[PDB]
Amino acid sequence: GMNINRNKIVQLADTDTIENLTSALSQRLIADQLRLTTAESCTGGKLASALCAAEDTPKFYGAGFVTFTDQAKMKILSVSQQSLERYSAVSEKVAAEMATGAIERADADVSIAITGYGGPEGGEDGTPAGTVWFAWHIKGQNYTAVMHFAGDCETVLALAVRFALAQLLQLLL
Amino acid sequence: GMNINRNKIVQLADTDTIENLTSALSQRLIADQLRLTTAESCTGGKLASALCAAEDTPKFYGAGFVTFTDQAKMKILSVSQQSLERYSAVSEKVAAEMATGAIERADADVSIAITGYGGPEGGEDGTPAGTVWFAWHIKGQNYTAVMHFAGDCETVLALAVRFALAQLLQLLL
Ligand SMILES: [Cl-]
């Protein structure tokens, strides 16, 4: 029996700054004695940077992976070649595998994965620019969400980082 | 004999901006058919993000590591615990092992590693804030240098990223 009270796509508010989100997230994971790891592609390391700028980072976060290419996803995060060929790197399946691959490599408890098209170009399969797939691993369970962000590449990547954090907060309720 | 010209330590200039250095590095690495990987700590993923912002990132860069803790440095990049106990995480020996460890995990040709004190705190062994150790791996050979940047943490981190990139370029000439 699946309870769906927490399945809300968070709507980012101006109060959901990187600073405020990592404030809430850091103290929550420290309180829960949980260790976070991250895997990202299009955001390039900016999610990791958000967490490394948080307070008391070493008490909950150590390992961040940036895997910009198909080969890096396959080698570092054990994303399967078959899944990339079937679905492309910007896909629900690959995001989920990046989240479980980071868990494995880092020996962590919680993870966040981001893979998307920052823009101006979209996918060869027609996936429009601004589409970003996300995945989170929490308590042995995996979650995914897709978003379609408006604006240029700088604006899309900044929203993806904030969304990745804010939605983990939602899933931790 | 070792030639000082070819192995000189660079000095940052105002024209050495991130876009100009990554553009110069991208052309040079693609021309040489070499693959780059990075390992960073205090810079938090800003080095990787600078490389993922450059043009044709997939042709020369795939895998970036953020290892913010001792546990991450040991688990992800095979930094030895004894080197951490002996020299601390902000040291020449740990920087060098982060560079070689990244080469191995990524199966890359070239690597940069950064570990340091962005500030305001230094090391509790007297190592002042602003000290950053660097390592570069090229063609089997490892190079190191320590830097003492002035300014606040944001200023120190941006200087480190520029110097890491600038020095890689000169070693590649
Ligand atoms: Cl913000």
Short mmCIF file of C-alpha atoms and ligand atoms in Angstrom, two decimals:
data_model
loop_
_atom_site.label_atom_id
_atom_site.label_comp_id
_atom_site.label_asym_id
_atom_site.label_seq_id
_atom_site.Cartn_x
_atom_site.Cartn_y
_atom_site.Cartn_z
CA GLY A 1 0.00 0.00 0.00
CA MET A 2 1.62 3.19 -1.31
CA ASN A 3 1.11 6.40 0.71
CA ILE A 4 1.25 9.45 -1.56
CA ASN A 5 1.05 12.39 0.88
CA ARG A 6 4.69 13.30 0.25
CA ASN A 7 4.56 12.93 -3.58
CA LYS A 8 4.37 16.66 -4.28
CA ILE A 9 6.51 18.34 -6.92
CA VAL A 10 7.90 21.24 -4.90
CA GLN A 11 7.25 24.70 -6.35
CA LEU A 12 10.39 26.74 -5.74
CA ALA A 13 9.83 29.97 -3.80
CA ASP A 14 12.21 32.90 -3.46
CA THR A 15 12.80 31.76 0.14
CA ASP A 16 14.19 28.48 -1.28
CA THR A 17 17.66 29.91 -1.75
CA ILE A 18 20.68 27.60 -1.93
CA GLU A 19 21.67 28.96 1.48
CA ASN A 20 18.31 28.30 3.18
CA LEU A 21 17.86 24.87 1.59
CA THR A 22 21.29 23.60 2.62
CA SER A 23 20.69 25.04 6.09
CA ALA A 24 17.58 22.90 6.51
CA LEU A 25 19.08 19.87 4.77
CA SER A 26 22.39 19.86 6.65
CA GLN A 27 20.82 19.94 10.09
CA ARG A 28 18.22 17.33 9.12
CA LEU A 29 20.77 14.80 7.89
CA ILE A 30 23.13 15.46 10.81
CA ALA A 31 20.23 14.87 13.20
CA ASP A 32 19.38 11.63 11.39
CA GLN A 33 23.06 10.60 11.27
CA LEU A 34 22.72 10.11 7.51
CA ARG A 35 25.50 10.57 4.95
CA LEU A 36 24.74 12.21 1.59
CA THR A 37 26.40 11.76 -1.80
CA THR A 38 25.65 13.42 -5.15
CA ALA A 39 25.98 12.62 -8.85
CA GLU A 40 25.53 15.27 -11.52
CA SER A 41 26.01 15.87 -15.21
CA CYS A 42 24.70 19.11 -16.76
CA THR A 43 24.98 21.05 -13.47
CA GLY A 44 28.73 20.39 -13.66
CA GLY A 45 29.60 20.32 -9.95
CA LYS A 46 27.39 23.22 -8.86
CA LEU A 47 25.24 20.92 -6.67
CA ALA A 48 28.38 19.66 -4.90
CA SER A 49 29.54 23.28 -4.59
CA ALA A 50 26.23 24.21 -2.97
CA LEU A 51 26.73 21.48 -0.35
CA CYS A 52 30.43 22.20 0.22
CA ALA A 53 29.51 25.82 1.00
CA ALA A 54 27.01 24.69 3.62
CA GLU A 55 27.72 24.78 7.30
CA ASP A 56 29.25 21.68 8.85
CA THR A 57 29.52 19.94 5.46
CA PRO A 58 31.91 17.22 6.77
CA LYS A 59 29.30 16.02 9.26
CA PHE A 60 27.02 14.80 6.46
CA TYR A 61 28.69 15.10 3.02
CA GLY A 62 32.00 13.99 1.56
CA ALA A 63 31.67 12.48 -1.92
CA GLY A 64 30.43 14.23 -5.04
CA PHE A 65 30.62 12.86 -8.57
CA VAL A 66 30.55 14.82 -11.81
CA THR A 67 30.01 12.55 -14.83
CA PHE A 68 29.51 14.70 -17.92
CA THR A 69 29.77 11.98 -20.60
CA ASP A 70 28.27 8.57 -21.31
CA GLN A 71 31.61 6.90 -20.58
CA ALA A 72 32.04 8.66 -17.24
CA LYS A 73 28.54 7.61 -16.15
CA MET A 74 29.36 4.01 -17.14
CA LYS A 75 32.78 3.90 -15.45
CA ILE A 76 32.19 5.89 -12.25
CA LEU A 77 28.50 5.26 -11.52
CA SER A 78 27.98 1.83 -13.13
CA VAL A 79 25.24 3.18 -15.40
CA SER A 80 24.65 0.35 -17.86
CA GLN A 81 25.45 0.80 -21.55
CA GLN A 82 22.10 -0.81 -22.40
CA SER A 83 20.18 1.80 -20.40
CA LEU A 84 22.02 4.68 -22.13
CA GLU A 85 21.39 3.19 -25.58
CA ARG A 86 17.68 2.59 -24.88
CA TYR A 87 16.81 5.84 -23.12
CA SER A 88 19.63 8.42 -23.54
CA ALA A 89 21.60 9.94 -20.64
CA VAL A 90 18.73 12.37 -19.92
CA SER A 91 16.20 9.79 -18.76
CA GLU A 92 14.37 8.50 -15.72
CA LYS A 93 16.33 5.24 -15.85
CA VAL A 94 19.80 6.79 -16.05
CA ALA A 95 19.05 9.27 -13.26
CA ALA A 96 17.98 6.38 -11.01
CA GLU A 97 21.17 4.44 -11.82
CA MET A 98 23.30 7.49 -11.13
CA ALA A 99 21.69 7.78 -7.69
CA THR A 100 22.33 4.13 -6.84
CA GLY A 101 25.83 4.20 -8.34
CA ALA A 102 26.81 7.11 -6.10
CA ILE A 103 25.47 5.25 -3.06
CA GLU A 104 27.69 2.29 -3.99
CA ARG A 105 30.89 4.23 -4.71
CA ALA A 106 30.61 6.48 -1.65
CA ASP A 107 29.19 4.01 0.91
CA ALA A 108 26.57 6.68 1.67
CA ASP A 109 22.96 6.57 2.92
CA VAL A 110 21.22 9.25 0.80
CA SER A 111 21.92 10.45 -2.73
CA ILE A 112 20.82 13.00 -5.33
CA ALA A 113 21.22 12.59 -9.09
CA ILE A 114 20.80 15.27 -11.80
CA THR A 115 20.91 14.74 -15.56
CA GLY A 116 19.36 17.14 -18.07
CA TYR A 117 19.57 19.57 -21.01
CA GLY A 118 20.60 23.01 -19.77
CA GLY A 119 20.04 24.39 -23.28
CA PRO A 120 19.94 25.94 -25.91
CA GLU A 121 19.93 22.49 -27.53
CA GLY A 122 17.66 19.61 -26.55
CA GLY A 123 17.94 15.89 -27.16
CA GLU A 124 18.42 14.01 -30.40
CA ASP A 125 15.22 12.11 -29.53
CA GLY A 126 13.28 15.40 -29.41
CA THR A 127 13.54 15.93 -25.65
CA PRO A 128 13.28 19.74 -25.38
CA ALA A 129 15.90 21.98 -23.86
CA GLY A 130 15.21 22.67 -20.18
CA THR A 131 14.16 19.06 -19.41
CA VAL A 132 15.97 17.73 -16.33
CA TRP A 133 15.54 14.29 -14.75
CA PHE A 134 16.22 13.85 -11.03
CA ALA A 135 16.60 10.86 -8.75
CA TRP A 136 16.91 10.43 -4.97
CA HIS A 137 17.85 7.37 -2.91
CA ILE A 138 16.49 7.38 0.65
CA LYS A 139 16.27 4.49 3.12
CA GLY A 140 16.92 1.79 0.53
CA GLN A 141 14.30 3.32 -1.80
CA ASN A 142 14.67 5.26 -5.06
CA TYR A 143 12.58 8.19 -6.34
CA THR A 144 12.54 10.13 -9.62
CA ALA A 145 10.98 13.32 -10.97
CA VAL A 146 11.19 15.22 -14.26
CA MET A 147 11.03 19.02 -14.67
CA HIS A 148 10.84 21.43 -17.62
CA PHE A 149 12.59 24.67 -16.68
CA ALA A 150 12.22 27.91 -18.64
CA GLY A 151 15.03 30.36 -19.32
CA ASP A 152 18.56 30.22 -20.63
CA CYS A 153 21.12 27.62 -19.62
CA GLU A 154 22.41 29.56 -16.59
CA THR A 155 18.85 29.91 -15.27
CA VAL A 156 17.98 26.25 -15.89
CA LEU A 157 21.05 24.87 -14.14
CA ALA A 158 20.49 27.11 -11.12
CA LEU A 159 16.88 26.01 -10.79
CA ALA A 160 17.92 22.35 -11.12
CA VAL A 161 20.33 22.65 -8.19
CA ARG A 162 17.71 24.38 -5.99
CA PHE A 163 15.02 21.89 -7.02
CA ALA A 164 17.24 18.86 -6.34
CA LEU A 165 17.77 20.11 -2.76
CA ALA A 166 14.20 21.28 -2.09
CA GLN A 167 12.68 18.02 -3.31
CA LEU A 168 14.96 16.00 -1.04
CA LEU A 169 13.53 18.07 1.81
CA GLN A 170 10.01 17.14 0.66
CA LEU A 171 10.91 13.45 0.49
CA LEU A 172 12.42 13.61 4.01
CA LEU A 173 9.12 14.64 5.60
CA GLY B 1 68.89 17.45 -15.89
CA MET B 2 65.64 19.27 -15.19
CA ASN B 3 64.90 22.35 -17.29
CA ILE B 4 63.42 25.32 -15.40
CA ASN B 5 61.79 26.91 -18.46
CA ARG B 6 59.62 23.94 -19.46
CA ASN B 7 58.76 23.21 -15.80
CA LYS B 8 58.27 26.77 -14.53
CA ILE B 9 55.54 27.57 -12.02
CA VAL B 10 53.18 30.09 -13.59
CA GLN B 11 52.10 33.43 -12.19
CA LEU B 12 48.46 34.43 -12.65
CA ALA B 13 47.75 37.47 -14.81
CA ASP B 14 44.50 39.39 -15.27
CA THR B 15 44.03 37.93 -18.75
CA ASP B 16 44.03 34.44 -17.12
CA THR B 17 40.25 34.25 -16.69
CA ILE B 18 38.30 30.98 -16.43
CA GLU B 19 36.76 31.19 -19.91
CA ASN B 20 40.11 32.01 -21.53
CA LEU B 21 41.96 29.24 -19.70
CA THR B 22 39.35 26.53 -20.27
CA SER B 23 39.17 27.58 -23.93
CA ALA B 24 42.96 27.34 -24.24
CA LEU B 25 42.96 24.03 -22.35
CA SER B 26 40.12 22.58 -24.41
CA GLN B 27 41.87 23.23 -27.73
CA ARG B 28 45.19 21.94 -26.39
CA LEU B 29 43.81 18.75 -24.84
CA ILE B 30 41.65 17.95 -27.88
CA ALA B 31 44.64 18.64 -30.15
CA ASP B 32 46.82 16.24 -28.13
CA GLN B 33 44.01 13.64 -27.83
CA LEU B 34 44.27 13.58 -24.02
CA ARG B 35 41.50 13.08 -21.45
CA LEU B 36 41.43 15.17 -18.27
CA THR B 37 40.02 14.31 -14.84
CA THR B 38 39.93 16.41 -11.67
CA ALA B 39 39.91 15.91 -7.90
CA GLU B 40 39.01 18.74 -5.56
CA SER B 41 38.20 19.41 -1.94
CA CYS B 42 37.96 22.99 -0.69
CA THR B 43 37.00 24.29 -4.15
CA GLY B 44 33.91 22.13 -3.78
CA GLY B 45 33.29 21.30 -7.45
CA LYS B 46 33.96 24.77 -8.91
CA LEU B 47 36.94 23.38 -10.85
CA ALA B 48 34.75 20.72 -12.45
CA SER B 49 31.98 23.26 -13.12
CA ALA B 50 34.41 25.55 -14.92
CA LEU B 51 35.45 22.67 -17.19
CA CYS B 52 31.85 21.60 -17.84
CA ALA B 53 31.06 25.20 -18.86
CA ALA B 54 33.71 25.20 -21.60
CA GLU B 55 33.09 24.40 -25.24
CA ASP B 56 33.27 20.77 -26.35
CA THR B 57 33.70 19.49 -22.78
CA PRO B 58 32.81 15.91 -23.89
CA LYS B 59 35.86 15.73 -26.16
CA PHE B 60 38.39 16.09 -23.33
CA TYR B 61 36.67 15.88 -19.93
CA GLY B 62 34.36 13.35 -18.32
CA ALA B 63 34.98 12.68 -14.64
CA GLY B 64 35.37 15.10 -11.74
CA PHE B 65 35.62 14.11 -8.08
CA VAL B 66 34.77 16.15 -5.00
CA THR B 67 36.23 14.51 -1.88
CA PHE B 68 35.57 16.94 0.97
CA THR B 69 36.45 14.59 3.87
CA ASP B 70 39.21 12.18 4.82
CA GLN B 71 36.75 9.30 4.38
CA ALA B 72 35.95 10.48 0.84
CA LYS B 73 39.61 10.96 -0.10
CA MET B 74 40.44 7.43 1.11
CA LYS B 75 37.34 5.71 -0.32
CA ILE B 76 37.08 7.46 -3.70
CA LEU B 77 40.71 8.26 -4.55
CA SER B 78 42.65 5.70 -2.46
CA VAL B 79 44.46 8.34 -0.40
CA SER B 80 46.34 6.42 2.26
CA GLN B 81 45.26 6.90 5.86
CA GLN B 82 48.91 7.03 6.90
CA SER B 83 49.57 10.02 4.62
CA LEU B 84 46.60 11.81 6.18
CA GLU B 85 47.76 10.99 9.72
CA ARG B 86 51.28 12.14 8.87
CA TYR B 87 50.70 15.25 6.80
CA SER B 88 46.96 16.09 7.10
CA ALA B 89 44.53 16.49 4.19
CA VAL B 90 46.10 19.82 3.14
CA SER B 91 49.51 18.50 2.15
CA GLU B 92 51.77 17.76 -0.79
CA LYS B 93 51.52 13.99 -0.40
CA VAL B 94 47.72 13.95 -0.28
CA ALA B 95 47.38 16.30 -3.27
CA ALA B 96 49.65 13.98 -5.27
CA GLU B 97 47.67 10.88 -4.30
CA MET B 98 44.43 12.62 -5.22
CA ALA B 99 45.88 13.33 -8.68
CA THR B 100 47.07 9.77 -9.27
CA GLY B 101 43.92 8.32 -7.72
CA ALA B 102 41.72 10.30 -10.11
CA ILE B 103 43.75 9.09 -13.10
CA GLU B 104 43.07 5.50 -12.02
CA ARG B 105 39.33 5.84 -11.35
CA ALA B 106 38.67 7.72 -14.60
CA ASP B 107 41.25 5.94 -16.83
CA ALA B 108 42.29 9.44 -17.91
CA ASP B 109 45.57 10.81 -19.26
CA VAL B 110 45.83 14.07 -17.29
CA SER B 111 44.60 15.26 -13.88
CA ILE B 112 44.50 18.25 -11.52
CA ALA B 113 44.10 18.00 -7.72
CA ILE B 114 43.32 20.82 -5.23
CA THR B 115 43.24 20.59 -1.42
CA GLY B 116 43.49 23.57 0.88
CA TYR B 117 42.08 26.00 3.45
CA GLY B 118 39.71 28.46 1.80
CA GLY B 119 39.23 30.25 5.12
CA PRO B 120 38.62 31.87 7.51
CA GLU B 121 40.05 28.91 9.46
CA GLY B 122 43.46 27.40 8.81
CA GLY B 123 44.85 24.08 9.91
CA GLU B 124 44.99 23.33 13.61
CA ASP B 125 48.67 22.54 13.03
CA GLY B 126 49.41 26.19 12.23
CA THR B 127 48.85 25.95 8.47
CA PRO B 128 47.36 29.40 7.75
CA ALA B 129 44.12 30.11 5.95
CA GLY B 130 44.63 30.55 2.22
CA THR B 131 47.24 27.79 1.81
CA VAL B 132 46.39 25.48 -1.10
CA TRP B 133 48.45 22.51 -2.34
CA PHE B 134 48.18 21.49 -5.99
CA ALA B 135 49.15 18.45 -8.01
CA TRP B 136 49.11 17.77 -11.73
CA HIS B 137 49.64 14.40 -13.43
CA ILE B 138 50.94 14.40 -17.01
CA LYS B 139 52.39 11.43 -18.91
CA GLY B 140 53.20 9.39 -15.82
CA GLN B 141 54.84 12.38 -14.09
CA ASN B 142 53.43 14.25 -11.10
CA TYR B 143 54.04 17.91 -10.29
CA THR B 144 53.19 19.82 -7.10
CA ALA B 145 53.14 23.39 -5.78
CA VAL B 146 51.80 25.16 -2.68
CA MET B 147 50.18 28.60 -2.78
CA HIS B 148 49.30 31.15 -0.10
CA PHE B 149 46.44 33.28 -1.42
CA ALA B 150 45.14 36.39 0.31
CA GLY B 151 41.47 37.35 0.63
CA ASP B 152 38.31 35.76 1.96
CA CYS B 153 37.17 32.24 1.18
CA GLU B 154 35.36 33.07 -2.07
CA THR B 155 38.41 34.98 -3.32
CA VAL B 156 40.77 32.18 -2.31
CA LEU B 157 38.69 29.49 -4.05
CA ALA B 158 38.50 31.39 -7.35
CA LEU B 159 42.24 32.05 -7.32
CA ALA B 160 42.89 28.34 -6.77
CA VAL B 161 40.73 27.32 -9.75
CA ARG B 162 42.49 29.80 -12.06
CA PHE B 163 45.96 28.78 -10.86
CA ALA B 164 45.13 25.06 -11.18
CA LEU B 165 44.08 25.63 -14.82
CA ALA B 166 46.89 28.03 -15.72
CA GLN B 167 49.59 25.68 -14.44
CA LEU B 168 48.15 22.70 -16.32
CA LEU B 169 48.35 24.72 -19.52
CA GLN B 170 52.02 25.59 -19.06
CA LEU B 171 52.94 22.00 -18.20
CA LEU B 172 51.23 20.95 -21.47
CA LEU B 173 53.24 23.27 -23.72
CL CL C 1 19.75 30.96 -4.51
#
